[PDB]
Amino acid sequence: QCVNLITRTQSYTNSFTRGVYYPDK
Amino acid sequence: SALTQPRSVSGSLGQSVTISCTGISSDVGGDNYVSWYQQHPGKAPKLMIYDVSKRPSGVPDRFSGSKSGNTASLTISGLQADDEADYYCCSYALSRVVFGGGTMLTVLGQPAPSVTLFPPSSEELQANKATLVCLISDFYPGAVTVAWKASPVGVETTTPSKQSNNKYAASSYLSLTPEQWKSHYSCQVTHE
Amino acid sequence: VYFASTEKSNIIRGWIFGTTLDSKTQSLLIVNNATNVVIKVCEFQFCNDPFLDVYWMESEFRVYSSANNCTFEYVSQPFLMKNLREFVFKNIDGYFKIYSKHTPINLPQGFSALEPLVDLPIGINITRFQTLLALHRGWTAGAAAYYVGYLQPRTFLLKYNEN
Amino acid sequence: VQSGAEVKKPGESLKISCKGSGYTFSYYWIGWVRQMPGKGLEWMGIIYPGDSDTRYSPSFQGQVTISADKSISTAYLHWSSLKASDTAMYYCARQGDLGDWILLGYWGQGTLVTVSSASTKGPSVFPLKSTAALGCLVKDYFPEPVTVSWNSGALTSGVHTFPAVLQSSGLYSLSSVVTVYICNVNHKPSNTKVDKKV
Amino acid sequence: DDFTGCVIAWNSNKLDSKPSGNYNYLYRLFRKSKLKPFERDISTEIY
Numbered sequence: 001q002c003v004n005l006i007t008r009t010q011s012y013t014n015s016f017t018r019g020v021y022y023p024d025k
Numbered sequence: 026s027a028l029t030q031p032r033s034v035s036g037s038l039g040q041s042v043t044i045s046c047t048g049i050s051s052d053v054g055g056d057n058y059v060s061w062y063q064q065h066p067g068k069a070p071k072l073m074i075y076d077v078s079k080r081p082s083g084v085p086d087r088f089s090g091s092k093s094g095n096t097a098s099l100t101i102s103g104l105q106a107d108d109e110a111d112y113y114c115c116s117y118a119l120s121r122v123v124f125g126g127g128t129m130l131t132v133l134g135q136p137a138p139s140v141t142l143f144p145p146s147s148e149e150l151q152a153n154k155a156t157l158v159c160l161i162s163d164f165y166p167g168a169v170t171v172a173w174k175a176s177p178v179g180v181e182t183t184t185p186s187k188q189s190n191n192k193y194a195a196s197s198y199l200s201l202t203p204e205q206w207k208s209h210y211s212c213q214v215t216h217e
Numbered sequence: 218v219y220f221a222s223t224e225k226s227n228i229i230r231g232w233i234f235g236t237t238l239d240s241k242t243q244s245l246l247i248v249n250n251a252t253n254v255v256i257k258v259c260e261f262q263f264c265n266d267p268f269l270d271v272y273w274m275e276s277e278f279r280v281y282s283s284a285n286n287c288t289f290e291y292v293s294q295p296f297l298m299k300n301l302r303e304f305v306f307k308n309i310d311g312y313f314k315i316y317s318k319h320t321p322i323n324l325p326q327g328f329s330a331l332e333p334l335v336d337l338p339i340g341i342n343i344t345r346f347q348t349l350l351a352l353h354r355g356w357t358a359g360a361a362a363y364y365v366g367y368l369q370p371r372t373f374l375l376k377y378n379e380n
Numbered sequence: 381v382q383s384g385a386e387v388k389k390p391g392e393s394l395k396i397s398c399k400g401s402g403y404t405f406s407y408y409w410i411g412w413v414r415q416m417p418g419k420g421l422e423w424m425g426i427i428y429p430g431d432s433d434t435r436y437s438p439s440f441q442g443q444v445t446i447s448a449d450k451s452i453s454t455a456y457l458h459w460s461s462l463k464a465s466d467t468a469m470y471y472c473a474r475q476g477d478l479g480d481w482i483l484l485g486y487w488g489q490g491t492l493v494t495v496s497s498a499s500t501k502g503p504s505v506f507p508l509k510s511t512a513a514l515g516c517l518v519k520d521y522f523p524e525p526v527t528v529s530w531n532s533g534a535l536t537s538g539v540h541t542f543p544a545v546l547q548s549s550g551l552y553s554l555s556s557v558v559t560v561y562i563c564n565v566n567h568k569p570s571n572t573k574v575d576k577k578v
Numbered sequence: 579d580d581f582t583g584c585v586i587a588w589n590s591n592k593l594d595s596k597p598s599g600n601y602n603y604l605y606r607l608f609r610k611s612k613l614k615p616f617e618r619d620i621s622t623e624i625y
Binding site: 342 | 580616617618621
């Protein structure tokens, strides 16, 4: 089926130093 | 790998039948490398079902196939008398042609065997021979028994016949000496 | 994109990847269920609000309507089975790279490098993505929060310690 | 139409043929598939009308070679140091515009090669209350492919031929009936024809 | 641009060609933009 049930809101947050990952192994 | 097929099936007139086909391999490029061939007993084979996603030319629409994983099936509808033939599935994904174990399509339907007796000829009696031939034909079921009476009586017989008139036929050739034949026979046939 | 979520109730169960999401082109569908997760790309017909209806029994795939012309399928161990989970998805020269690493928290300060977990080639155009919310079915109410960050070509100077 | 199968011994390098029509022998693949009595089809290999890029089966790499004739569009096969298990119904098949290059679109007629060493013993015919039907009997013959006709084939309706019965001494025996008369028996391996009247 | 490997290619006129016309092979001639390296496009939309 296809029913519209889930709702979502928007907000902002400051990412200080997140998102770092190993570029190579 | 070897393709596995049922040795014999039992269909019916007007009903449908599904012939199984397992062991089909696949390579890079597709998985629909499945083709069926129709070979009548004692006749020339004819291409019947290939590329089941499509429909061959000249083949009636009552023939179709399906695919489910490594197992394929041949859906045949409208079974008739002339539909009795051999069918084999083929797999050519790896550029190698392989065939199944052989399938025999048999149909059921409404079926008195003809019982005739012939005495030996004079040419056989002159050669010190006496062959008693009891001919059996015109019977649809595959149940038949040949026996003679002397007290019960080399002797050979063949139950299956050749596909010429869509009817089964069996015969037995009792070889005895003329001295023992003239000293006394009757043919006993058992049928459903 | 950069996906992060601190929901410690096992709600996020995969991500949808595609460019049109109307069964016109291939689309990557990820299902991060309890055990033996499945990753299959096909021509799914995604709904307006896709979700998983757990009924226990797994969901009956209410996300897509039908999908038959598929090309690739991948099955492996679950992905990261108050804890914070971070995810990074990149699609470079057809290869889809996944980075993830769980770090317990008390987005706080500090550094926590992510580890490459799954790298599989897809060779498809990915333009839009949407998360999946898990719920039980009379639908059971629930809430969830997650973070979304867009990646950009950058240059970092990494410092490696003695370990 | 195909050539007959003469009784040969293992090691005489026999040859089979098949005649096809309805296509151009220029760029269509063509091969041969045998069928032993009691089993299914067995694909051996195929040949191309131009550069003969023959691809033989792994079980037929050094057992049979393709020597088809291109100038007459008639296929041929060559053997060397044959065996007793080589008796099979060879079917000639071609590519055809129906499927792919390996797919077999059409098939030939098929000829069952017979291999034996019983010196090709000559057959014998013997005659036989219904009158109304008559019949004849054929005994003392080792080769199986023996046909019986009535008046050189003048009567076709109401005529039936029963399969031969294997005797204990290795020979066979055949019976035939006709709706009512000279019965004609032809023996191909020995080229002997015997006539009998009931 | 950083490809590493052998680009193996050979002639297959005797296998992937038929006199009656082997139309089972298609190719995309029109597209909205240039294709990225290692990308597949199977859509049958009209451009």
